RNA sequence: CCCGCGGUGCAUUAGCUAGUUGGUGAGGUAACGGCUCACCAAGGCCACGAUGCAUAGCCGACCUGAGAGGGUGAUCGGCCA
RNA sequence: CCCUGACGGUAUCUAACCAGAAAGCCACGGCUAACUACGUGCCAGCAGCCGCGGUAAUACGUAGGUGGCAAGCGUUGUCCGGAUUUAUUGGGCGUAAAGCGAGCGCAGGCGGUUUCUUAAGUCUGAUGUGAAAGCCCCCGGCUCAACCGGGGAGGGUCAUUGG
């Protein structure tokens, strides 16, 4: 649902580009921003947006970026296990670590896993690297995470019988 | 090699400190050189982390080779994390508890006090400044020659004595009494940043 | 020939010696059939460790020790237990 | 005679030489990088006091020191007959 | 020709799944039936009825869905194969998305889940996960 | 490919090749040339001097040599710096570096080591060009 | 001294063997044995890679990698020549 | 009881005197931390890959400043990683590289349901062995550390025998 956009939310900049269309005569300029959203607490969110200069532009999408944000559930610290996220030539797998280890992620991939306060996690790239899909991807991969409260009660379980 | 030079850059530079909150950053808290006060833009993720380290590396003035081989043994551990471990281990060695004491103002001083053998821990003579102090030693002043003049003003001056530090003032023995901890210890740079920072070294 | 001897086992000036059951063909520091305890040269009153369960029967199967080897073998009362079993049954 | 020797099983092969058989014994083995099983064979010649077994039998044989250039195996026992 | 009937009846689970209708039919089999149960044990699946006429099927199962008709398994796969088998030993059994799945393996006492294996320390054949 | 075709026919890689395959080399006395010891560097005489011009976009005039090696076997080695004093028949000594301004060089010799001399009016980075501290 | 299993490239290298494979006896050796003799027979090995050509002492170990792996066999110990 | 040191008057310990004898190498356009002057003018030169140099060059050469390491600092060569770029773990074949022009078939690879049996694969227990030194875990000695010593684990696709 829709995660109101109500809190105190540190946002980043993860990608600019000089982005030209050609008309009659010579060239045309935008910018195209990529912009992450959160509070280091468990709700991210992305967006973009183009101007024609750069501070209209980052504005532009965090406007965007605060219309869209996730739950990413998480079990101290660490995410609950093990996920691979895919969308469009971007796969990227997601592992829960050790207490205090740190995050071992690459740009993209880490903006998005600190401004949702994650601590501990081991990542890696086996795709493209363009920075919208692995950002997309992430949060494609967030999205599979399952708490461990929702499985025991979706079957007719208790917790402490499936761990 | 240890370090020479004027000292106050190395804290303008940081942006820290380090020498006791007495102020070198005082007048011009900008960096050193032509470019100090016209300051430019961003500083990456890469100047981050490798300024938090240096920051940590010249608190306690030692060489690369050394913090790196202090680093990779407080990873051993696996009781607690491994950035307040390492910061610990960090604060072990006999120039700090010669510091901490409060024998010696600075570090540089601290340093001298120990390499031209003037302590002692249990009674014998220890020289080198990076020994390890473990819980519970008494760290003396060679009570052959412990009346020197400068020594003895800074037993006075009593600027900063910590919550794990014990002493007494007549026969100048102390000890650590245990283990600090983070909010004990600069809760201000980090330990996290340090960590990231080697692992891709 | 079997021997009961020792092999160096220090660093430049700080020797230490293992006390060893060798064919006495062999080098000094090279192969052996087991090792029979220690010796420590340095340590005012000498160290020694040593099993003397094995000395024992190494000793009644013809071995010998050097001359180094006997006289820390009989500070330690080894060579009077061979005495007494050999020569009284 | 405490200690003891080795025994096959295997299917007579050749039987033209003079008190001298070839026996194959069978085995499945796996491959050492990727994981599937296949089978090797090696063969194996064995003494015959008089010629009797004949192909397709299903033979025990024992190992005995050198009795030939090849030939270290004896006969033990034929367990099932061919036809 | 079909090869793998194991494979066949984890595929109807599936595809049957993701279309999200309750019901599915397969001829039946001692280790089908045997890993019906298992799925039945756990949480999986609603209900499953044997009918058996003149060749050796069928098996009935009902599948279940959640209270905003969300699916209570999400996928399913088969690991060993006739063409490559998995073997494993009593300290190599698997532990499937952090024990929020199971394994199925067959040992010699049973077919039993993988709690049940690494409970009385033995292994074998592994069948399938199921998350 | 199914894993009984990978147990027929297993799987190759590709092989790898120096860039300054005539620094592996061996000796042309006795009987023939042995490929065993990679060095760091080979020494030989240089069979001729002078200029050369460069590739597109660039324009110069570029300096070199040509040399013959321990090895017997010849290739051309650019000279860097600002002003040398090689001639015919010196003999110099070469290290590993491609040049790209044009082919068929893939050396450079290095300054202040034998017959060579260090250029003398370096002040900055004087460990390469081989120039002495000057009191100044 | 004999045996099981294990570690390299080439199929733009498919046929290799005539004391060769087995039997009888004789000699010979610490010792079994084509080990060597005389006679009798026509066998032996190979696509699960024989034969040939090229390269190489083998191992405990050492470097690197999350692991599975990949690259080396210098100081020190063992076996070989 | 008595008798023997090449190293060697070596390590070490005590007294006096003096800040006096003891800092260099690389880089600073983006990757990648650290910028301004002057000289020169597609020249002289630089480059690991992008690429710089034709009058105001943070990319060439000097000076001032700054960054990284430090009794060392850079360069070349060789190997593993990054490289899922030979993919068992762990990739693909409509148009990007890639379905033989099609069938028939020996050897091989893989095979429907079920009752009893066997124990080759598979799983499991006990015993033997996998030297010493190494890596690793605990403990101890050199003023600390490198280093040295004591006790352990680990490492087999291994053998024998019982389920």
Same mark, same amino acid.
């Given at each position: 649902?829709?995660?109101?956009?109500?809190?105190?939310?540190?946002?980043?900049?993860?990608?600019? @580009? %000089?982005?030209?269309?050609?008309?009659?005569?010579?060239? %045309?300029?935008?910018?195209?921003?990529?912009?992450?959203?959160?509070?280091? @607490?468990?709700?991210?969110?992305?967006?973009?947006?183009?101007?024609?200069?750069?501070?209209?532009?980052?504005?532009?999408?965090?406007?965007?970026?605060?219309? @869209?944000?996730?739950?990413?559930?998480?079990?101290?610290?660490?995410?609950?296990?093990?996920?691979?996220?895919?969308?469009?030539? /971007? %796969?990227?797998?997601?592992?829960?670590?050790?207490? /205090?280890?740190?995050?071992?992620?690459?740009?993209?991939?880490?903006?998005?896993?600190?401004?949702?306060?994650?601590?501990?996690?081991?990542?890696?790239?086996?795709?493209? @690297?363009?920075?919208?899909?692995?950002?997309?991807?992430?949060?494609?991969?967030?999205?599979?995470?399952?708490?461990?409260?929702?499985?025991?009660?979706?079957?007719?379980?208790?917790?402490?019988?499936?761990? | 090699?240890?370090?020479?030079?004027?000292?106050?850059?190395?804290?303008?530079?940081?942006?820290?400190?380090?020498?006791?909150?007495?102020?070198?950053?005082?007048?011009?808290?900008?960096?050193?050189?032509?470019?100090?006060?016209?300051?430019?833009?961003?500083?990456?993720?890469?100047?981050?982390?490798?300024?938090?380290?240096?920051?940590?590396?010249?608190?306690?003035?030692?060489?690369?080779?050394?913090?790196?081989?202090?680093?990779?043994?407080?990873?051993? =551990?696996?009781?607690?994390?491994?950035?307040?471990?390492?910061?610990?281990?960090?604060?072990?060695?006999?120039?700090?508890?010669?510091?901490?004491?409060?024998?010696?103002?600075?570090?540089?001083?601290?340093?001298?006090?120990?390499?031209?053998?003037?302590?002692?821990?249990?009674?014998?003579?220890?020289? =080198?400044?990076?020994?390890?102090?473990?819980?519970?030693?008494?760290?003396?002043?060679?009570?052959?020659?412990?009346?020197?003049?400068? =020594?003895?003003?800074?037993?006075?001056?009593?600027?900063?004595?910590?919550?794990?530090?014990?002493?007494?003032?007549?026969?100048?023995?102390?000890?650590?009494?245990?283990?600090?901890?983070?909010?004990?210890?600069?809760?201000?740079?980090?330990?996290?940043?340090?960590?990231?920072?080697?692992?891709?070294? | 020939?079997?021997?009961?001897?020792?092999?160096?086992?220090?660093?430049?000036?700080?020797?230490?010696?293992?006390?060893?059951?060798?064919?006495?063909?062999?080098?000094?520091?090279?192969?052996?059939?087991?090792?029979?305890?220690?010796?420590?040269?340095?340590?005012?009153?000498?160290?020694?460790?040593?099993?003397?369960?094995?000395?024992?029967?190494?000793?009644?199967?013809?071995?010998?020790?050097?001359?180094?080897?006997?006289?820390?073998?009989?500070?330690?009362?080894?060579?009077?237990?061979?005495?007494?079993?050999?020569?009284?049954? | 005679?405490?200690?003891?020797?080795?025994?096959?099983?295997?299917? *007579?092969?050749?039987?033209?030489?003079?008190?001298?058989?070839?026996? *194959?014994?069978?085995?499945?083995?796996?491959?050492?990088?990727?994981? &599937?099983?296949?089978?090797?064979?090696?063969?194996? &010649?064995?003494?015959?006091?008089?010629?009797?077994? &004949? *192909?397709?039998?299903? *033979?025990?044989?024992?190992?005995?020191?050198?009795?030939?250039?090849? &030939?270290?195996?004896?006969?033990?026992?034929?367990?099932?007959?061919?036809? | 020709?079909?090869?793998?009937?194991?494979?066949?009846?984890?595929?109807?689970?599936?595809?049957? +799944?993701?279309?999200?209708?309750?019901?599915?039919?397969?001829?039946?089999?001692?280790?089908?039936?045997?890993?019906?149960?298992?799925?039945?044990?756990?949480?999986?699946?609603?209900?499953?009825?044997?009918?058996?006429?003149?060749?050796?099927?069928?098996?009935?199962?009902?599948?279940?869905?959640?209270?905003?008709?969300?699916?209570?398994?999400? +996928?399913?796969?088969?690991?060993?194969?006739?063409?490559?088998?998995?073997?494993?030993?009593?300290?190599?059994?698997?532990?499937?998305?952090?024990?929020?799945?199971?394994?199925?393996?067959?040992?010699?006492?049973?077919?039993?889940?993988?709690?049940?294996?690494?409970?009385? +320390?033995?292994?074998?054949?592994?069948?399938?996960?199921?998350? | 490919?199914?894993?009984?075709?990978?147990?027929?026919?297993?799987?190759?890689?590709?092989?790898?090749?120096?860039?300054?395959?005539?620094?592996?080399?061996?000796?042309?006395?006795?009987?023939?040339?042995?490929?065993?010891?990679?060095?760091?560097?080979?020494?030989?005489?240089?069979?001729?001097?002078?200029?050369?011009?460069?590739?597109?976009?660039?324009?110069?005039?570029?300096?070199?040599?040509?040399?013959?090696?321990?090895?017997?076997?010849?290739?051309?080695?650019?000279?860097?710096?600002?002003?040398?004093?090689?001639?015919?028949?010196?003999?110099?000594?070469?290290?590993?570096?491609?040049?790209?301004?044009?082919?068929?060089?893939?050396?450079?010799?290095?300054?202040?080591?034998?017959?060579?001399?260090?250029?003398?009016?370096?002040?900055?980075?004087?460990?390469?060009?081989?120039?002495?501290?000057?009191?100044?």
């Amino acid at each position: 649902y829709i995660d109101p956009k109500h809190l105190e939310l540190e946002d980043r900049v993860v990608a600019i @580009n %000089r982005v030209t269309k050609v008309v009659k005569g010579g060239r %045309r300029l935008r910018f195209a921003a990529l912009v992450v959203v959160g509070d280091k @607490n468990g709700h991210v969110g992305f967006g973009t947006g183009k101007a024609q200069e750069v501070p209209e532009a980052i504005r532009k999408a965090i406007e965007d970026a605060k219309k @869209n944000l996730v739950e990413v559930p998480m079990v101290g610290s660490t995410i609950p296990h093990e996920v691979i996220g895919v969308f469009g030539g /971007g %796969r990227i797998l997601m592992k829960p670590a050790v207490e /205090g280890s740190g995050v071992a992620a690459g740009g993209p991939v880490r903006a998005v896993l600190e401004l949702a306060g994650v601590a501990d996690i081991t990542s890696k790239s086996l795709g493209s @690297n363009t920075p919208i899909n692995v950002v997309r991807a992430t949060v494609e991969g967030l999205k599979q995470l399952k708490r461990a409260e929702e499985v025991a009660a979706l079957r007719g379980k208790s917790v402490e019988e499936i761990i | 090699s240890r370090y020479t030079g004027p000292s106050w850059k190395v804290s303008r530079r940081l942006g820290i400190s380090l020498s006791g909150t007495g102020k070198e950053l005082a007048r011009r808290p900008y960096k050193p050189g032509q470019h100090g006060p016209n300051s430019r833009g961003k500083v990456s993720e890469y100047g981050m982390q490798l300024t938090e380290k240096q920051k940590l590396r010249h608190m306690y003035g030692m060489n690369e080779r050394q913090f790196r081989t202090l680093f990779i043994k407080a990873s051993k =551990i696996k009781e607690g994390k491994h950035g307040v471990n390492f910061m610990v281990l960090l604060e072990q060695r006999l120039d700090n508890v010669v510091y901490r004491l409060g024998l010696a103002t600075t570090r540089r001083q601290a340093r001298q006090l120990v390499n031209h053998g003037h302590i002692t821990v249990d009674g014998k003579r220890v020289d =080198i400044p990076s020994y390890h102090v473990e819980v519970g030693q008494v760290i003396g002043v060679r009570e052959k020659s412990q009346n020197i003049s400068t =020594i003895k003003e800074a037993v006075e001056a009593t600027v900063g004595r910590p919550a794990f530090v014990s002493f007494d003032t007549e026969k100048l023995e102390g000890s650590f009494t245990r283990l600090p901890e983070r909010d004990e210890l600069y809760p201000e740079i980090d330990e996290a940043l340090v960590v990231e920072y080697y692992n891709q070294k | 020939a079997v021997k009961i001897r020792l092999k160096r086992m220090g660093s430049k000036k700080s020797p230490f010696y293992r006390i060893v059951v060798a064919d006495s063909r062999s080098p000094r520091d090279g192969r052996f059939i087991e090792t029979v305890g220690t010796y420590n040269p340095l340590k005012d009153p000498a160290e020694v460790v040593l099993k003397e369960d094995l000395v024992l029967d190494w000793l009644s199967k013809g071995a010998q020790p050097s001359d180094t080897v006997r006289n820390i073998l009989s500070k330690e009362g080894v060579m009077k237990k061979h005495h007494e079993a050999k020569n009284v049954k | 005679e405490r200690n003891q020797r080795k025994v096959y099983q295997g299917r *007579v092969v050749s039987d033209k030489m003079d008190k001298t058989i070839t026996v *194959v014994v069978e085995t499945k083995k796996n491959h050492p990088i990727y994981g &599937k099983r296949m089978k090797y064979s090696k063969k194996y &010649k064995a003494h015959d006091e008089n010629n009797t077994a &004949k *192909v397709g039998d299903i *033979v025990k044989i024992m190992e005995t020191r050198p009795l030939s250039a090849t &030939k270290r195996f004896r006969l033990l026992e034929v367990v099932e007959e061919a036809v | 020709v079909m090869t793998d009937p194991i494979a066949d009846f984890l595929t109807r689970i599936r595809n049957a +799944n993701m279309v999200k209708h309750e019901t599915l039919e397969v001829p039946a089999s001692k280790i089908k039936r045997d890993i019906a149960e298992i799925l039945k044990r756990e949480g999986f699946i609603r209900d499953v009825e044997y009918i058996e006429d003149d060749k050796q099927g069928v098996i009935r199962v009902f599948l279940k869905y959640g209270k905003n008709e969300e699916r209570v398994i999400t +996928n399913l796969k088969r690991i060993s194969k006739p063409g490559l088998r998995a073997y494993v030993k009593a300290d190599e059994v698997p532990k499937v998305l952090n024990g929020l799945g199971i394994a199925i393996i067959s040992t010699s006492e049973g077919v039993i889940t993988d709690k049940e294996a690494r409970a009385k +320390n033995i292994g074998g054949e592994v069948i399938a996960y199921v998350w | 490919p199914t894993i009984n075709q990978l147990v027929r026919k297993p799987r190759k890689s590709k092989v790898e090749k120096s860039d300054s395959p005539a620094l592996n080399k061996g000796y042309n006395s006795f009987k023939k040339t042995q490929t065993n010891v990679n060095s760091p560097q080979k020494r030989g005489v240089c069979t001729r001097v002078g200029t050369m011009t460069p590739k597109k976009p660039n324009s110069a005039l570029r300096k070199y040599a040509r040399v013959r090696l321990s090895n017997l076997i010849e290739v051309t080695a650019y000279i860097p710096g600002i002003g040398h004093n090689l001639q015919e028949h010196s003999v110099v000594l070469l290290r590993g570096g491609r040049v790209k301004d044009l082919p068929g060089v893939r050396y450079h010799i290095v300054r202040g080591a034998l017959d060579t001399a260090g250029v003398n009016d370096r002040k900055q980075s004087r460990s390469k060009y081989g120039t002495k501290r000057p009191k100044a």
